[PDB]
Amino acid sequence: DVQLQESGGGSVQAGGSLRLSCVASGVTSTRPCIGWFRQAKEREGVAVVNFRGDSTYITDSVKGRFTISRDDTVYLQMNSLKPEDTATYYCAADVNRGGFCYIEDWYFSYWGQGTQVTVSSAAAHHH
């Protein structure tokens, strides 16, 4: 199996930033498309990146604040965070599309355990 190791979650204030990472191991043939998904509600897409670094985002609003990049190690840089960005973030892999990507979860067969991201309003935030 492809194995996915997530890191970089935490608790921040609204307007803050976090950088998630996902490291894929167990890749023996096709390098995977790596995607980030989140679930606060149903699971939803965020962004995906193909084996050569080309990215696709769920919406323009998301693309304006988050950036996905690839070194099989992928980063999701999250800026200008909204309270509503609070969720468990999951990385996922698709090795059945030649290394290329779709944004939808039904193309992904390997899932990380999830990493919690908590974004608090100014009134609620404590270090």
Author numbering: 1 to 40, 43 to 52, 52A, 53 to 72, 76 to 82, 82A, 82B, 82C, ...
What did the authors write?
Based on these favorable features of nanobodies, we aimed at selecting broadly neutralizing nanobodies against HIV-1 from dromedaries immunized with soluble trimeric gp140 SOSIP immunogens. Overall, we could select Env-specific nanobodies from 25 families, of which six nanobodies showed potent neutralization of primary heterologous Tier 2 HIV-1 strains from several subtypes in a standardized pseudovirus-based in vitro neutralization assay.
Crystal structures were determined so far for VHH-5 (2.3 Å resolution) and VHH-28 (1.15 Å resolution); for A6 no crystal structure is available yet. In both structures, CDR3 is tethered to the body of the VHH by a disulfide bond between residue H33, and H100C or H100B, in VHH-5 or VHH-28, respectively. VHH-9 and VHH-28 bound very well to optC SOSIP, but only weakly to ZM197M, which would explain why there is competition with CD4bs mAbs on the first, but not on the latter. Evidently, the neutralization patterns of VHH-28 and VHH-A6 show some degree of complementarity, as they cover all but two HIV-1 strains in the panel, including the epidemiologically most relevant subtypes C, A and B. 3D reconstructions of ZM197M-VHH A6, 5, and 28, each resolved at ~25 Å, were used to dock in a high resolution model of BG505 SOSIP.664-PGV04 complex, which confirmed the presence of extra density at the CD4bs.
